Design an enzyme around this catalytic site. Sequence first.
Site, PDB file in Angstrom:
ATOM      1  N   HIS A   1       0.973  -1.378   0.100  1.00  8.55           N
ATOM      2  CA  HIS A   1       0.014  -0.157  -0.088  1.00  8.55           C
ATOM      3  C   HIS A   1       0.918   1.208   0.014  1.00  8.55           C
ATOM      4  O   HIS A   1       0.544   2.263  -0.537  1.00  8.55           O
ATOM      5  CB  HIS A   1      -1.027  -0.058   1.326  1.00  8.55           C
ATOM      6  CG  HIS A   1      -1.608  -1.179   1.592  1.00  8.55           C
ATOM      7  ND1 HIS A   1      -2.843  -1.813   0.633  1.00  8.55           N
ATOM      8  CD2 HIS A   1      -1.406  -2.274   2.337  1.00  8.55           C
ATOM      9  CE1 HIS A   1      -2.963  -3.160   1.192  1.00  8.55           C
ATOM     10  NE2 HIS A   1      -2.119  -3.376   2.197  1.00  8.55           N
TER      11      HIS A   1
ATOM     12  N   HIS B   1       5.269   6.979   6.745  1.00  9.22           N
ATOM     13  CA  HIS B   1       4.954   6.633   5.503  1.00  9.22           C
ATOM     14  C   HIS B   1       4.450   7.699   4.841  1.00  9.22           C
ATOM     15  O   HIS B   1       4.320   8.927   5.388  1.00  9.22           O
ATOM     16  CB  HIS B   1       3.678   5.466   5.371  1.00  9.22           C
ATOM     17  CG  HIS B   1       2.568   5.906   6.061  1.00  9.22           C
ATOM     18  ND1 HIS B   1       2.649   5.743   7.381  1.00  9.22           N
ATOM     19  CD2 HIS B   1       1.645   6.583   5.619  1.00  9.22           C
ATOM     20  CE1 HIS B   1       1.262   6.250   7.668  1.00  9.22           C
ATOM     21  NE2 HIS B   1       0.757   6.728   6.661  1.00  9.22           N
TER      22      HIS B   1
ATOM     23  N   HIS C   1       1.652   9.182   1.596  1.00 16.17           N
ATOM     24  CA  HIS C   1       0.634   8.851   0.322  1.00 16.17           C
ATOM     25  C   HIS C   1       1.001   9.831  -0.739  1.00 16.17           C
ATOM     26  O   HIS C   1       1.474  11.133  -0.493  1.00 16.17           O
ATOM     27  CB  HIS C   1      -0.441   9.286   1.201  1.00 16.17           C
ATOM     28  CG  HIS C   1      -1.107   8.401   2.340  1.00 16.17           C
ATOM     29  ND1 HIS C   1      -1.754   7.266   2.150  1.00 16.17           N
ATOM     30  CD2 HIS C   1      -0.554   8.520   3.703  1.00 16.17           C
ATOM     31  CE1 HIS C   1      -1.857   6.916   3.477  1.00 16.17           C
ATOM     32  NE2 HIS C   1      -1.243   7.679   4.362  1.00 16.17           N
TER      33      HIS C   1
ATOM     34  N   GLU D   1      -3.775  13.413   1.075  1.00 16.07           N
ATOM     35  CA  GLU D   1      -4.964  13.109   1.944  1.00 16.07           C
ATOM     36  C   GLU D   1      -5.795  14.247   2.513  1.00 16.07           C
ATOM     37  O   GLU D   1      -6.882  14.696   2.013  1.00 16.07           O
ATOM     38  CB  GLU D   1      -4.687  12.075   2.980  1.00 16.07           C
ATOM     39  CG  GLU D   1      -4.022  10.916   2.462  1.00 16.07           C
ATOM     40  CD  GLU D   1      -4.223   9.729   3.108  1.00 16.07           C
ATOM     41  OE1 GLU D   1      -3.977   9.567   4.227  1.00 16.07           O
ATOM     42  OE2 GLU D   1      -4.620   8.496   2.445  1.00 16.07           O
TER      43      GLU D   1
ATOM     44  N   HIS E   1       3.288  10.863   7.091  1.00 14.87           N
ATOM     45  CA  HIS E   1       2.519  10.625   8.176  1.00 14.87           C
ATOM     46  C   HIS E   1       3.554  10.017   9.343  1.00 14.87           C
ATOM     47  O   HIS E   1       4.088   8.699   8.953  1.00 14.87           O
ATOM     48  CB  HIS E   1       1.461   9.755   7.998  1.00 14.87           C
ATOM     49  CG  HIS E   1       0.353  10.335   7.170  1.00 14.87           C
ATOM     50  ND1 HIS E   1      -0.847   9.649   6.641  1.00 14.87           N
ATOM     51  CD2 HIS E   1       0.029  11.776   7.118  1.00 14.87           C
ATOM     52  CE1 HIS E   1      -1.573  10.360   5.979  1.00 14.87           C
ATOM     53  NE2 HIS E   1      -1.258  11.809   6.352  1.00 14.87           N
TER      54      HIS E   1
ATOM     55  N   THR F   1      -6.023   6.423   7.964  1.00 15.82           N
ATOM     56  CA  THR F   1      -6.584   6.783   6.565  1.00 15.82           C
ATOM     57  C   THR F   1      -6.601   5.566   5.646  1.00 15.82           C
ATOM     58  O   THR F   1      -7.059   5.490   4.448  1.00 15.82           O
ATOM     59  CB  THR F   1      -5.997   7.886   6.004  1.00 15.82           C
ATOM     60  OG1 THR F   1      -4.603   7.481   5.624  1.00 15.82           O
ATOM     61  CG2 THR F   1      -6.172   9.252   6.739  1.00 15.82           C
TER      62      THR F   1
HETATM   63  O1  LIG Z   1      -2.178   5.079   6.995  1.00 21.98           O
HETATM   64  N1  LIG Z   1      -1.792   4.804   8.069  1.00 21.98           N
HETATM   65  C1  LIG Z   1      -1.466   3.440   8.763  1.00 21.98           C
HETATM   66  C2  LIG Z   1      -0.990   3.435   9.965  1.00 21.98           C
HETATM   67  C3  LIG Z   1      -1.142   4.378  10.771  1.00 21.98           C
HETATM   68  F1  LIG Z   1      -0.920   4.011  12.120  1.00 21.98           F
HETATM   69  C4  LIG Z   1      -1.382   5.545  10.368  1.00 21.98           C
HETATM   70  C5  LIG Z   1      -1.844   5.882   8.970  1.00 21.98           C
HETATM   71  S1  LIG Z   1      -2.260   7.157   8.358  1.00 21.98           S
HETATM   72 ZN   LIG Z   2      -1.032   7.502   6.371  1.00 23.16          ZN
END
Ligand SMILES: On1ccc(F)cc1=S
Ligand SMILES: [Zn+2]
EC number: 4.2.1.1
Length: 258
Positions: free
Chosen positions: A62, A92, A94, A104, A117, A196
Amino acid sequence: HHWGYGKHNGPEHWHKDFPIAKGERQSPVDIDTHTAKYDPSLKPLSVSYDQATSLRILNNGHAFNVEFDDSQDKAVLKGGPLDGTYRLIQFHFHWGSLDGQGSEHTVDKKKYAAELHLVHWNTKYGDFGKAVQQPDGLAVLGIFLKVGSAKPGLQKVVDVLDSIKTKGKSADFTNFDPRGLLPESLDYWTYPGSLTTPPLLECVTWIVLKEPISVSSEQVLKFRKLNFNGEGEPEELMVDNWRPAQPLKNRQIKASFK
Ligand SMILES: On1ccc(F)cc1=S
Ligand SMILES: [Zn+2]
């Protein structure tokens, strides 16, 4: 037939396996800058990343996660809207297929090229798995990316993506300093929301910085060479791994700044 970002498994489908997708505190949201209330009572945000211990980078199908040693109070977020101490566990991004989309959160409906994030869990709940079951379990620091000048502190991340091209690949990723991803200003908006991605748990205090970081076209081009698919499967580029803006419902976005 697992959740994803395609026509048949993307965000409009997630509610069937994860009914909280239509809940009362979903993320992301559009930040209306003229409706957000300055709250002079918000404390300054405290980002203490000097002792941060990065361990590994993972393509999870993802996104990619840069994972941290969260077994001690080494990289913590405190202050701002938060009560107590939140430990950094991973970051990570997006991102989009084109520089015009990818974030987002939006700001007055503006979409940035990407969104970082940094995910932290509330130490009062002992581990991440228990924290995500609590309405104040996580604090996610959201940082917008725009395309312009290179972010030097990002390049070490960009250079290891070739080694984690496909789903389930990981690589040693020690001594990465996440302070190199922060903008100058810690001015922020905050509101109660969710993960998200599935399982879309309503456990997050969002802290979205006003000031974006600039990344180069060449840096985001390298994000877009990643694969959602596993090794020896048909190539699906890891692009447009963003959930769109959800209903604000009964929620107030507060601004740390006049
Ligand atoms: O996408 N994502 C995945 C894990 C998390 F703890 C926070 C978010 S924003
Ligand atoms: Zn995220």
